[PDB]
TrEMBL record, chain E:
Stretches the record annotates as Disordered: 161-185
Protein name (database record): Small ribosomal subunit protein uS4
PANTHER family: 30S 40S RIBOSOMAL PROTEIN, SMALL RIBOSOMAL SUBUNIT PROTEIN US4
Keyword Acetylation appears in the UniProt entry: yes
GO molecular function: rRNA binding; structural constituent of ribosome
Keywords: Acetylation, Cytoplasm, Isopeptide bond, Metal-binding, Nucleus, Phosphoprotein, Ribonucleoprotein, Ribosomal protein, RNA-binding, rRNA-binding, Ubl conjugation
Summary of the function given for this chain in its UniProt record: Component of the small ribosomal subunit. The ribosome is a large ribonucleoprotein complex responsible for the synthesis of proteins in the cell. Part of the small subunit (SSU) processome, first precursor of the small eukaryotic ribosomal subunit. During the assembly of the SSU processome in the nucleolus, many ribosome biogenesis factors, an RNA chaperone and ribosomal proteins associate with the nascent pre-rRNA and work in concert to generate RNA folding, modifications, rearrangements and cleavage as well as targeted degradation of pre-ribosomal RNA by the RNA exosome.
Keyword check for Cytoplasm: yes
Gene Ontology process terms (BP): ribosomal small subunit biogenesis; translation
GO cellular-component term (any): nucleolus
Family label: Belongs to the universal ribosomal protein uS4 family.
Classification via InterPro entries: Ribosomal_uS4 (IPR022801), Ribosomal_uS4_CS (IPR018079), Ribosomal_uS4_euk/arc (IPR005710), Ribosomal_uS4_N (IPR001912), S4_RNA-bd (IPR002942), S4_RNA-bd_sf (IPR036986)
Subcellular localization(s) per the UniProt record: Cytoplasm; Nucleus, Nucleolus
Amino acid sequence: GKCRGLRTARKLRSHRRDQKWHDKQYKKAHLGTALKANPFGGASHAKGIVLEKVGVEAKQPNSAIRKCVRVQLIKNGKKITAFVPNDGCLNFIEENDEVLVAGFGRKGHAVGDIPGVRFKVVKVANVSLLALYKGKKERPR
Amino acid sequence: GFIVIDGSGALFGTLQGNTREVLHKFTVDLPKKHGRGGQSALRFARLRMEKRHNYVRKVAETAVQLFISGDKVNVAGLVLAGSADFKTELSQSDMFDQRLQSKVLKLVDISYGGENGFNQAIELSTEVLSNVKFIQEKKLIGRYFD
Amino acid sequence: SLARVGKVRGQTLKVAKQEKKKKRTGRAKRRMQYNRRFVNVVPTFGKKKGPNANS
Amino acid sequence: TVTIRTRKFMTNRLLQRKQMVIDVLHPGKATVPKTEIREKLAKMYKTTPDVIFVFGFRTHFGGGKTTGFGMIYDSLDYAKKNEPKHRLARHGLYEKKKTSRKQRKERKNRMKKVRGTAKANVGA
Amino acid sequence: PVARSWVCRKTYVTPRRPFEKSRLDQELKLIGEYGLRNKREVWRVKFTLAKIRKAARELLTLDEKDPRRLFEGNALLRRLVRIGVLDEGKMKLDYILGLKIEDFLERRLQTQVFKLGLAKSIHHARVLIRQRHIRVRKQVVNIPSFIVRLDSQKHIDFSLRSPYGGGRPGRVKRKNAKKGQGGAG
RNA sequence: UAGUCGCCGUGCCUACCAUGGUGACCACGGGUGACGGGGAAUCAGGGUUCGAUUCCGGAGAGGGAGCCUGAGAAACGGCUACCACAUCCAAGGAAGGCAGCAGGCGCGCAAAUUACCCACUCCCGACCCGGGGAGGUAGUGACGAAAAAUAACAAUACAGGACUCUUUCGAGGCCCUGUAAUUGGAAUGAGUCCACUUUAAAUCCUUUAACGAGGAUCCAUUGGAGGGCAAGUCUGGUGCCAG
Ligand SMILES: [Mg+2]
Ligand SMILES: [Mg+2]
Ligand SMILES: [Mg+2]
Ligand SMILES: [Mg+2]
Ligand SMILES: [Mg+2]
Ligand SMILES: [Mg+2]
Ligand SMILES: [Mg+2]
Ligand SMILES: [Mg+2]
Ligand SMILES: [Mg+2]
Ligand SMILES: [Mg+2]
Ligand SMILES: [Mg+2]
Ligand SMILES: [Mg+2]
C-alpha cells in the first residue's frame, strides 16, 4: 500500500478488485470462455469414438512418429487428437470403438513433441488398455 | 451392421459384399412371465414391460455405440432385428437417434433368435441389397435350386 | 508412417522368469533391514557403496 | 462353578417388585442358558421359576463375566397382565403370529377397496 | 434423518519432506528398537505430541494466575503423572519442551514386556500378546499398544486360560500331541 | 385530506390537492455455475476458498391462474379451467401428475435390495385395544476413520565384534549379533464347525468342544532405480527405428 490512511478501506478494496483481473489466472478461472471452450467443461474424463489413426511427427532435437487417434465426442461433437502412449498398443485400438479419454497434466498446454495434443486414452470397450498391454485380460470377441 | 435381439440373447454382426462377420453377442437374465403368482401376477405385465424396456435400453445403447459415430452413422446400413416386436421398440424408442431415424434402412423379424435368423433377416433384406453380388448370388442360386 | 507399430517389444526374446526364495515380510522384514543397516556391519573407512552397487 | 451377586438393586413401590442387574461370574464357559438360569434364580429368590423372565445377557471379551438384566414380578397373573409380548415369546408360552407386516397392509387396502357385505368375502 | 454420529477424524499427519536421508535413518533406528509395524504407527504419536506442544504453548502464553491456565495445566499434569513419565515433583509444563517421544514409546506394552524379561525378544513379546497369552487384573488383553499405568504395571503375569498358563495346550500342541500319540498308537 | 376494504397502522385501494424522492458514500440497470445461516478445508501471524446435503429459516410439488370446505390451506398423495404432455372407448364417453419409499426410463465420467418390524424412539385418533415405507433393522457398498496376523524361539554349524589369549595368522569361550532350505518342537487365527447367548425371528460379534501351519505353498501388492529424487556403469536384444 501507499495510502496508509485510517479511512481508505473502500479506496483500497476497490483498487484490489480492479487489479485481480489483470492476473491472468484469476481471469482464467472466473470468465466462462475458457470453461465453455474446453470440451471437457471442467471434467477429468470424456468418452468418445475413434474415427481415424494418425501418425503425427515430433518436434526438433527429438525425432519420432507419435501415434495419435482422432476421436469425436458424443455430447458436443468436437474433435480431438487423443494420443495412445506405449509400445504396441495401437493394434488393439480398433476403429469405431468407444474409448474414455483423459487429460495430460497440463491444463491447456501442449506437451513436447506431439504438437497440440492434451489428451490420452484410458479404456477401450470397457477394457483397460493397461490390462491389454500387460496381458492380464483379453479383448472380448 | 446387424442387431439381433431375443428373449434368449442378443447378437451383432456386419455384412460386406460377399463376407459376413460377427462383431459381438451377449446375454441378459431377464426373469420370465411366471415370476411370482397371486400377489405380483396382476402387476407383473407392467413391471415386466419396464424390465423389457430396460433390456431395450441396453440394446439401444449397443446400437448407438456401434451404428452412431459422433451422432452420425459411419457404417452405411443398419438392419435391426428381433422377434415379438423387439425391433419396433428399438426403432421407435427415443434413445434411438433421430439422425438415425432418417437412415433407418430396415427392421427384420426372426424366430428362435440368432445367427440363422440373422441369415433369414438377410434373406428378407435381399431386395434392399440389390447392388450386392451376394444378393445377386442368393437370387441366382435360388433359381438354380429351383 | 504407421508400419512400424509394435516391432521391438515383439522381436525381443520372451524369456521365462526364474524362481526365487520368498522374501520375509512385515514387521520382521523391517527388522531385518534395520539390522542390515546398523547391527551387522562395523565402521569402515571411505565412501559407502550402494546396496545394489555391483561392479 | 458359577457365582451370582446383584447390582443396582431397587425396590419399586409402584409395581411392588424388585429389579436388579445380575452380575454373574462364570469362568471358562459360554453364556449359560435361560431355562437353567430361571430355575436357579427361582431357588435363589424363594419363588417359582415360572415367573422369572430374564434376558439380554452379554458375555464380556476375555470370558469370565456375563451381564443381563432381570426383575421379579409378584404374580404370574400380574406379570402376564403387564409384561412384553416379545419377552413371553422368548420362552414360547406366548407365540406371536407369523403374518408378515406387508401382508397385513395389503389386506388393509384390499378391504379398503370394496364397499358392503363383500367385506366378509374379503378374508380369503 | 438418522440416528448416527458421523464424528471421526484422521489420527495422524505425514511429514512435509518425503526423502530426508536423516529422517529415514531416524525412523529405522526407532523401528529397530521397538519392533513397530510401519511408519504411520510412529507418526500418529508425532501427532499426539503436536497437540501437546501446541496447547502447552497456549498456557505459557497466557498471563499467570489465570484460573483457566491453572486448572488446565494441572489436569494435563494429572494425565502425564498417571502414565508415570514425569515425576510428581517434576511436574511443570516448561519441561514439556525439553521432552521427547522416546519416553512415551517406553510405556507401550510390547516394550515394557521385553524390558520386564518375561518375553525373550521384543518381537516374541508381540507374538505372545497378539496370541492372547497374558492378562491384567482379570482382564484379557489382545492389544499390544495398551498404555500401562503404573498401578497396573506390576500385575502382569501369565493368564490361567492358556497353554503357557495353567490350562489346556494350544492348537499346535493339540496337533503334535494328537499326531505323536497316534504315532505311538 | 376524507373515505373503501381489511382484525388494526400504511397508496392496501378510491377520490381531490401539493410536486416531491434517489444519485461518484456506485443509485439505477445488467450478471451471479448464489436459497441463507449455524459450519468445513486450509493454515506461523495476517488471510484464502467452499458450505444442495441429516439442526434452524424460506420457497415448490408438470406450466400459470382460480376456489370451496376449515380454527388453521390461496392445500396440490382436495377440486375447476387453459397450456404442455401422456392412458382406454361400442364414438356418447372415462380417467391423470413419485422434487413420498422401493424400482425404472433418460442424461451422463458419475451413484444400492420392489427386503423385515412397531420390539426401541416419537406422532395421530372418539383412544387401556388401531395405524405409521416417519423411524428403525438387515442386504450391497475400497467416498473415508480406528485397532490388528502373514511368524516367534532354541540348539548346531560359519562370519564377525567387546573379553582372556595370541608376534600376526590363530587359540578359550563365560559374552554375543547376524546368517544357514541344518535340525528341534512350542504358539495362533482366517476358516470349517456341534452348542448356547444375541435378537421381533435371525445374522454378525463375544464364550466354548472337535478339525484347521514348517517352504507355517493358507503363494501381498502398486509405482520406481541419470538429475529433479531413496535406489544396478549386472546381462542379452534394438541402433534417431521402436519408445
Ligand atoms: Mg454457530
Ligand atoms: Mg432448514
Ligand atoms: Mg432463516
Ligand atoms: Mg412447494
Ligand atoms: Mg395446486
Ligand atoms: Mg403413491
Ligand atoms: Mg403434501
Ligand atoms: Mg419427476
Ligand atoms: Mg414404535
Ligand atoms: Mg423411509
Ligand atoms: Mg526430480
Ligand atoms: Mg540416488
